[PDB]
Amino acid sequence: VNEVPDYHEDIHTYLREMEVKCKPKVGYMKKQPDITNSMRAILVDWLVEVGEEYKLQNETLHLAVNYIDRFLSSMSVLRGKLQLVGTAAMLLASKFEEIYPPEVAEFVYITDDTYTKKQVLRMEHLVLKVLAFDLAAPTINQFLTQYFLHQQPANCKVESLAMFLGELSLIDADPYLKYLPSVIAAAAFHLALYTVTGQSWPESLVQKTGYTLETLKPCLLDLHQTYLRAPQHAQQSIREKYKNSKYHGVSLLNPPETLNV
Amino acid sequence: SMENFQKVEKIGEGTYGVVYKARNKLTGEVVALKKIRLTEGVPSTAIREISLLKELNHPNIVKLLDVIHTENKLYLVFEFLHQDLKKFMDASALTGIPLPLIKSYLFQLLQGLAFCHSHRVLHRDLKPQNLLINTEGAIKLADFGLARAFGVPVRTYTHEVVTLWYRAPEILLGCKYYSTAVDIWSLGCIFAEMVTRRALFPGDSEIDQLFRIFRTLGTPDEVVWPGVTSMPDYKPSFPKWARQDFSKVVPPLDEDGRSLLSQMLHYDPNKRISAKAALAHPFFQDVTKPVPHL
């Protein structure tokens, strides 16, 4: 009943439909005159530190990034305000998802007093207006946790490695904005299963999702590279975080050299 | 914004804010305006209520029509329903609710609740003040101020949740996880209450509430509920009351009614009946949609 037997299929079907409606414009960054994929990566890395510092759920981090990419799909923003957008998104996601969200004042403290409390609150209001209050978005995590119920048997390092790979994908708009959450999660799950145990994307997940190694191949190739170069990336807060034993030190495992795919 | 609406009457108030009955001057539609209380920006209860009610579109769930967000007020505009089930039960204190209408209302509540659970929403505050009825025979789930979107499988959510009288035992016993089963417990307590016109477990503290449940259904052990004696707030010193026969718990109720009620109130959340499955129960074989008799 914690795995809702009479409803998980209805729920899966619904999240699939909703991820298409909540999807950012794939080409948004080209149409922003003052910001870049590189500035967005600094921002998301910063939100990972904030989440680690205040002990936030991973789901909160994923929703914040969804709200930010949708906002920037419709609104032009100057470089000096990108952090204000991000701070309001993180506050809204916390309110939606957390049992105990940080107070507004704690969100003003972590911007190093770049902004006022009045500015954070106004921006909260503007983000709600732009997204029209549609805040219950599908994330990579909502799909991953469902996919995990198909391990034979459950393996804790597979689970945390998949979380880690999915979380790395949030940093780099190119290429990952072109893939749906459910697809990034299938790729991350296969790669984690293969890296740890040598098994592959199972048949039961083909029956549930319609996805095969064939259809997942492009995303899986992009994701494999990201994993190989991850120690070289300019942003490292995700790697620091997954050293911790709460996540079974999975950021220490060694990526495989090939996939055979 | 509110220029199209003419306020007619204040009909309720509480911690949340206040509700008015109102009329659209141009279309004629009668609406409820729920004005939200405004510290810490927009409250999380309203963020959740608005985003989830925008996704949920079903004849036995209250319909959110519009949101008016002035930057100093927040009004939710709803389709209007005339009375709550609490006020109807009190007004039927003289000779009670006919059995066809009790069947219709429970059948409708199960449709609406199945729709929430199919869309990954727990209500977490089902009780007769939050269930609304109209003049045409309908009943609908309302007040999504405590609701939450859940993942599969669930994780740990807020412990201070259902109103005490309608609160499931897995919450009272401090379990790490709860799920769709908590909403079914509440509806089972509401089913009893419509048949008898008084609450089934009217406790005045968490511990009193547990003991009242145990005195009716019997104190659970490892046989009826695997893992119960290993739960954070389980005391070995709990008294061992005997299970009462169900014909004594709700005397006026026929055999089919009793079978359904017992499956709604099963101790182990894993055996407790789902809303979706309950619609097929034989208790509903002859179900209609009568209008309220008052």
Ligand SMILES: CN1CC[C@H](c2c(O)cc(O)c3c(=O)cc(-c4ccccc4Cl)oc23)[C@@H](O)C1
């Ligand atoms: C404490 N809760 C109670 C329910 C209340 C609420 C809703 O959420 C949504 C609604 O569409 C309505 C409505 O159309 C009429 C009434 C009502 C009827 C008769 C008497 C009193 C009232 Cl308030 O309430 C509604 C909810 O917001 C507050």
